[PDB]
Amino acid sequence: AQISVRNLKFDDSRSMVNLENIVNSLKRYMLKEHFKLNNIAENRNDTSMRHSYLQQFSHYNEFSQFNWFRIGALYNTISKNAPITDHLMGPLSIEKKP
Amino acid sequence: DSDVDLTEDLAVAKIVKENPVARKMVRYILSRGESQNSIITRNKLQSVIHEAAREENIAKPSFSKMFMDINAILYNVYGFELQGLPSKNNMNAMPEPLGHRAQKFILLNNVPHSKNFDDFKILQSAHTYEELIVTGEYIGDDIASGTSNTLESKLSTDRDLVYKGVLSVILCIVFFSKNNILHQELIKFLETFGIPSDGSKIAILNITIEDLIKSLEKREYIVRLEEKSDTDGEVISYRIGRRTQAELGLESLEKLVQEIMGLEKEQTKSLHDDIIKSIGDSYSI
Amino acid sequence: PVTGDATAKYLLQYILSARGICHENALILALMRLETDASTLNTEWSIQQWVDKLNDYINAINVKLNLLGYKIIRINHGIGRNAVTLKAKQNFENTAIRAHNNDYAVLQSIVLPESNRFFVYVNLASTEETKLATRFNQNEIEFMKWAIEQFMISGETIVEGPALETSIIVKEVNRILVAATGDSNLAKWRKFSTFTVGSTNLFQFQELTATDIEDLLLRLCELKWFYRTQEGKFGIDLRCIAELEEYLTSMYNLNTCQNCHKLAIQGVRCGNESCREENEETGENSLSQIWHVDCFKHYITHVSKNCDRCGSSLITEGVYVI
C-alpha cells in the first residue's frame, strides 16, 4: 500500500493542482495586490476545470504589491507550532555590581 | 479531575525548587534556541549542564532527569517541548522521539491548534499591511512617524513576518517539486514573486537572496546538496532539513495547503493522500 | 491540563507573541475568542466578569513564572482614557472585505472603549548571568546605553518658545485642562520638557556609521523599544521603561510619580523653582511631584487641585512634558 504511495512522483500534470497551480493559488492572496488600491477584481472565467481560474494570477509585475504579511501569519501561527518569544535584551540589564 | 491542574503546578514547583539549576537551564535554552532560531546540539547541552553544576556546586543531575524536568516545566508554563530530531544521516544512509538520546533538539509548543482562532491571528497580522506600505512606501526615518504599529499590534516586526512568508513559500515550492529543486530553477520560480534576482538587496528584509538562502540553510530549514559534476558544473539542489521535518507535520502541512487555496472543508477528501503522494519521501517516517 | 490549562497556554502565547507588549482590550478579545470553544456559546458573561477572569488568569501565570525568573507586569501608559482607545481608527474589531475596522465583533455587537493599562513581559533577574547571548552584539548594546543616556539627559530644559506642536499627548493634556475648567485662557504654559528628542543628535555617535546607526535604530523601533512621534523625534516606548524600571531608577535618580512604586517619563512636570531639597545640581521636580495623564486627571479632579509642592496655581502648572 504505502510502497505505491511513496513510489509515485509529482509534476506530471496531476489532476486537481500541480506545482504551477499550487504556486499561483498561493499568489491568489490578492486582497491587497490590486483589490485594495486598483479596485480591479479578478476576471472570473465562469476535475481539470477547477484550475481554469488560476491562469490570470501570473501578472504580478512587481513585488511590494503582494501581501507577504498574510502568508507570514499563515506560517508561524497555523503550522510549524511556533514557540516564538520576545527575546528581551540581557546585556543591557546586567549590572556589574562591584 | 479539577485538582489535576493544581497538583501538577504544585509538583512542577516542587521539582524546580529541588532543582534550582533547572530554572537557569530553561532560561538559557529558551534564549539560545531563539536568538538565532537555530538548532541546539547534545554537546552544547552537556557542556552547559556541567558548567551550571560546577558553578552552583550541586551534584550533576542525570541528563535524562534534567531533560524530563525541562520538558515538564516548559509544558506546564510555556507549553514548549524539546522534541527529538532524527539524525541527518538517516536519509543519507511511527518513530518515537528519542528525547533521552536524541542528538539535537528544538523548542516546540505542543498545545493543539484550534480550528478558527488562527483565523483571528492571521486577520490581525494582515489587516494593517494595507497601510504599512500604502502606495509602495515603508515605515522608518523615511517618513515623519514610526507608530504604524499603533501602541501595539499583532504584526510584530514586519521583518520576521516577511522572512517567515518567504520560508513558507520556499518550502511549498520545494515540497511539491518532487522534494528536489535546483538552485537556478528555484531562483527562476522565485523570480515570479518579484524578488530581485540580480543580487540587489530585497526591500523589506534588506538581505540579498543568496544571503537569505544561506541563512535558511544555517537554520537547518533546508539542506544544500553539493552535487559537484564536471559536465553539469557545480549544480546545487535543496532538500528539506530535518528541522522542518520535525517542525512542519503532515497534518499541519495539509491544513496549510488547504487554507492557502481556500477550498471548502467539505471537499477535504482525496487531499490527505494527494499531499502524501506529492511530498514523497521528504520525511524520515 | 484538559481544557483549563490550554486557555492559560494560549493567553501566555498571545501576550508573548506581540514582542512582549499588547493591549488589554486585545487580551480581553483574545480571551473571549478562545473561551468561545471551551464552554460552547459563552454568552452569559459580563465585561467586568471578563476583566476579573483575565486578571485571575494573569495572576496565575505571574505566580507560575515568578519562580522561573519571569513576570507579566501591568504598567499604565503615559496616555490614558479615550486617547489610548482611539489607536488607529478606534479598534479594528471599502472595495474589498479587508476593510472591517468596525465589523467582525466577537459578539453580535460589543465595545470595550475603556483602556488604561498595558501588559508587559519582562524578567526580574537584574544580574541575569544566564541570558547574555542576544541578536544584538556588544556594539549596539553600547549604542543602546548611550542612546538611553541621551534620552534621559534631554529631559532637562531651560526654556522653549510658544510653538505648540500638535502631538497626541498635548491634545489630551489640553482636553483634561478644559474638562477641569473651560476657561480656554492662556493657561497653556510655554515651557516644554522633552525626554524624546531625535534631532540628528544620535547620528553623532562615533563607533557606528550613519547607515549602520539608521538600520539599527529602525530595527529597534520595529522591535517596539523606541517609538517615533509624528514630528520625527525618537522616544523610548512603554516596554523599554517597563523592563528597566529598576535600572533607570537605580543608575539615575529620575523622579517617581505620585505612585510610590511606579516610574513616569511623560505627562506634566510643573517644577518651577521650588524643587524638593536641592538634589545635586538639577531641580524642576528632580526628586518627585510628577504625574501621568491619567494620574494628572485624577489629582486635579479630586481634592487638592493645586499642586502640593509648596503650593502653586493651575496657571503656572500644566508644564507640558513630551
Q: What technique solved it? A: cryo-EM
Angle, to 10 degrees, between the axis of helix B20-35 and the axis of helix B42-56?
140
Residue for grid cell 523615511: B142
Distance CA A23, CA B181 (A): 14
Structural domain includes residue A61: yes
Q: CA quadruple A49, A54, A58, A61: dihedral positive or negative?
A: positive
Q: Which residues of B touch C215 (CB under 8 A)?
A: 206
What does R_g of chain C's alpha carbons equal in angstroms?
A: 22
Say if B113 is an interface residue toward chain C (CB within 8 Å). Answer: no
For residue C321, give the 3-state DSSP assignment. Answer: strand
Name chain C contacts of B4, Cβ cutoff 8 Å: 1-2
d(CA C242, CA C289): 20
> Which three three-digit cell numbers place residue A38?
486598483
Q: Is the dihedral of CA B115, B119, B125, B126 positive or negative?
A: positive
Q: How far apart, in Å, are the Cα atoms of A91 and each of A79, B257, C52, C218?
A: 33, 41, 36, 20
The chain A residue lying nearest C133, using CA atoms, is A90
Judge: A93–C243 Cβ closer than 8 Å, yes or no: yes
Are A79 and B250 a contacting pair, CB within 8 Å? no
CA B190 – CA B196 distance, rounded (Å): 9
C134–chain A Cβ distance below 8 A for any pair = yes
Residue B231 belongs to domain with CATH number:
1.10.10
Q: Across-strand partners of C313?
A: none
Closest residue to B140, CB basis, from C33, C87, C218: C218
Whether B151 and C238 lie within 8 Å, measured CB to CB: yes
| A47 shares contact with chain B (CB less than 8 Å) | no
Q: How far apart are CA B35 and CA C52, in angstroms?
A: 35
- List the alpha helices (DSSP H) in chain B: 3-18, 20-35, 42-56, 63-73, 89-92, 117-127, 129-132, 160-176, 183-190, 209-218, 242-247, 250-261, 272-279
In a domain, A32, yes or no: yes
B151 inside domain: no
Domain boundary among the residues B109, B129, B149 is at B109
Report the Cα–Cα distance between both ends of chain B, in Å, rounded. 36
Which of chain C's residues have a Cβ under 8 Å away from the Cβ of A30?
Answer: none
| DSSP for C207-243, written as a single string | SS-HHHHHHHHHHHHHTTSEEE-TTS-EEE-HHHHHH
User: How many domains is chain B built from?
Assistant: 2
* Chain centre distance of CA C292: 10
Helix H or strand E encompassing A21: helix A19-26
Which 122-151 residues of chain B touch chain A by CB within 8 A? 122, 124-126, 128-130, 132-136
| B81 membership: H or E segment, kind and range | strand B80-85
Per the CB < 8 Å rule, is C22 touching B140? no
Considering only alpha carbons, which residue of chain B is nearest residue C62?
B77
A40 vs B: CB within 8 A: no
Q: Which cell goes with B250? A: 503532515
B70: Cα within 13 Å, side-chain hemisphere: 28
d(CA C128, CA C21): 21
> Residue B33 burial by CB count (10 A; 0-12/13-18/19+): exposed, middle or buried?
buried
Cβ contact A94–C247 (<8 Å): no
Cα dist from B280 to A42, B179, C108, whole Å: 34, 7, 46
- Of the candidates A31, A86, A93, the beta carbon closest to that of C247 is on A93
Q: Torsion over CA of C70, C74, C76 and C81, rounded to 10 degrees?
A: 150
Secondary structure letter of residue C69 according to DSSP: T
Which chain B residues are closer than 8 Å to C221 by Cβ?
140, 146
SS3 C71: strand
How many whole angstroms separate alpha carbon B213 and alpha carbon B222?
9
In a domain, residue B142? The reply is no
For residue B271, what are the domain limits? 159-279
> Residue B225: left if φ>0, alpha if ψ -120 to 50, beta else—which one?
beta
Q: What share of chain A is helix, strand, coil (3-state, %, to 5)?
A: 35, 0, 65
C247's grid cell: 535600572
Considering its fold, how many domains does chain A have in total?
1
Q: Do B126 and A81 touch (CB under 8 A)?
A: no
User: Which chain B residues are Cβ-neighbours of C37 within 8 angstroms?
Assistant: 114-115, 117
| B79, part of any domain | yes
Helical ranges in chain C per DSSP H: 4-16, 24-38, 47-66, 82-86, 138-153, 168-180, 210-222, 238-243, 245-251, 293-301
Query: Does B17 reach chain C within 8 Å, measured CB to CB?
Result: yes
Q: Where are the domains of chain C?
A: 4-122, 138-321
Report which of B162, C179, C318 is spatially closest to residue B170, judged by C-alpha positions: B162
The phi, psi pair for C45, rounded to 5°, reads -145, 145
In DSSP notation, B95-157 reads: ----TTT-SEEEEEE-SPP-SSHHHHHHHHHHHTHHHHSGGG--SSTTSS---TT-S--TTTT
A8, A19, B106, B34: which is closest to C134 by C-alpha?
B34
Which B-chain residues 218-277 have CB contacts (< 8 A) with chain C? none
- Specify the 3-state DSSP secondary structure of C91: coil
Residues B70, B174, single domain; the answer is no
Q: What are phi and psi of C23, to 5 degrees?
A: -90, 135
Residue C190 vs residues A43, C317, C321: alpha-carbon distances, Å: 60, 10, 11
Evaluate whether B52 touches B69 at the Cβ level (below 8 Å). Answer: no
Q: What is the DSSP string of C98-110?
A: T--TT---SSSS-
Contact indicator for A17, A25 with CB cutoff of 8 Å: yes
d(CA B87, CA C35): 40
What does DSSP say about strands C320-321 and C192-193: parallel, antiparallel, or unpaired?
parallel
Resolution, expressed in angstroms to one decimal: 4.2
- By the 8 A CB rule, do B70 and B25 touch? yes
CB-based contact A5 B257, cutoff 8 Å: no
C4-16 vs B3-18: helix axis angle to the nearest 10? Answer: 60
Q: Chain B: give the shortest CA distance to residue A37, in Å.
A: 8
Distance CA B60, CA B82 (A): 20
Cell 511606579, residue located: C262
Q: Which helix (H) or strand (E) holds A70?
A: helix A68-73
Under a CB-based contact definition with an 8 Å cutoff, are residues A54 and A22 in contact? no
Nearest to C133 among B32, B77, B154 (CB): B32
Pairwise CA distance, residues B188 & B27, whole Å:
42
* Closest residue of chain B to C119, computed from CA coordinates: B152
What's the longest Cα–Cα distance across chain A?
77
Burial of A1 (0-12, 13-18, 19+ CB in 10 A): exposed
How close B19 gets to chain A, by Cα (Å)? 23
First to last CA, chain C: 47
Looking at residue B76, what DSSP letter applies?
A: I
For residues B136 and B124, what is the distance between their CA atoms, to the nearest angstrom?
21
Question: What is the torsion angle, in degrees rounded to the nearest 10, for the CA atoms of residue B184, residue B188, residue B189 and residue B193?
Answer: 130
Gap between the Cα atoms of B216 and B220, Å rounded: 6
What single DSSP character describes residue B86?
-
**Looking at the complex, does the CB of residue B145 fall below 8 Å from at least one CB of chain C?**
yes
Across the beta sheet with B222-226, the strand order is B181-182, B236-240, B222-226
Same domain, B11 and B91: yes
| Torsion angle of the four alpha carbons C152, C154, C160, C164, in this order, in degrees rounded to the nearest 10 | -60
Pairwise CA distance, residues C157 & C136, whole Å:
32
The answer to whether C190 and C161 are in contact (CB under 8 A) is yes
User: Does residue B259 sit at the A interface (CB-CB below 8 Å)?
Assistant: yes
Domain hosting residue A63, numbered range: 2-78
Amino acid, res. C237: D
Size of interface B-C (CB pairs under 8 A): 126
Neighbouring chains of B at 3+ CB pairs within 8 Å? Answer: A, C
**Residue A20: enclosing H or E segment and its boundaries?**
helix A19-26
